[PDB]
Design a binder for this molecule. Sequence first.
Ligand SMILES: O=C(O)C[C@H](c1ccc2c(c1)OCO2)c1ccc2ccc(OCC(=O)NC3CCCCC3)cc2c1
Ligand SMILES: [Cl-]
Ligand SMILES: [Cl-]
Length: 291
Amino acid sequence: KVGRLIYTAGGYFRQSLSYLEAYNPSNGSWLRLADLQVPRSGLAGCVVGGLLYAVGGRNNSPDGNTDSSALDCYNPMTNQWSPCASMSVPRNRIGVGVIDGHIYAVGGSHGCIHHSSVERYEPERDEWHLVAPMLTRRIGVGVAVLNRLLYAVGGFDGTNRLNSAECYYPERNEWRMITPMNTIRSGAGVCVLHNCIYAAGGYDGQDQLNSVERYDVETETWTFVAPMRHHRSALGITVHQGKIYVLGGYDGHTFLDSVECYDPDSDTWSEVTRMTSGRSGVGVAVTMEPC
Ligand SMILES: O=C(O)C[C@H](c1ccc2c(c1)OCO2)c1ccc2ccc(OCC(=O)NC3CCCCC3)cc2c1
Ligand SMILES: [Cl-]
Ligand SMILES: [Cl-]
């Protein structure tokens, strides 16, 4: 359990960013690590076998926008990124989840296309394959895995921002709708903590949100918990040692540098650190500290 850092990859402030920075909750420190090979925002992060993966996104630059089909792998033992097999299609504003060592890439956009497609990466074989598509096209979708079931929450289908959510049952290669959230959320942070799927923040079509709700996978209800201190959309999120961390995002005025931490025992959020600069659209995951 000891020695794990919260890694934040990529993001957006004025343009897409190549930063990889890692926060140590035990001592408050931040480390700047090897930049991504290509600046990306709208990507997702995940970890399999101790390696950090950066999935999808877009490179917004002064010279244009390129949606990414890339999968790149960062090894903390070498502080180096290596390319992996690319996805079938570019996916900006993607959601990712891991089931039993396999990476699922969910939804996202490619230009004006809003994907319902989903694909699964096998690290052993360095191969992607498509699986059943979602019932809804979703970009800016939040994804989390609980009990080897994969949840896709919220997003934007091209016309409407969504309160709907759905679950993927791998042994049946099938998606089914779940109870919709109480709030429309595009670009929420979505994670798992204990027996619930949390959706924090997002954009409802009108305002950036500070509200947070959680789906109990047994009772099939969504319940609001304490709101974050800051409204935020396009935030990074992860869970570490039984607490949710939210990183950055956009509040309607500022690209936030704040990191807040949710304690489920007290049902409270606290501000724990600040990133080195404000940014939105980051990928976040937890793995061992580097060499
Ligand atoms: O619902 C929609 O149309 C899409 C939605 C969105 C959210 C909030 C919004 C907004 C649009 O326009 C008003 O504010 C969204 C959802 C998830 C995202 C995940 C990553 C991401 O990476 C790039 C990035 O960070 N971009 C900045 C640009 C400047 C404003 C904030 C995001 C962008 C995302 C956008
Ligand atoms: Cl974008
Ligand atoms: Cl992960």
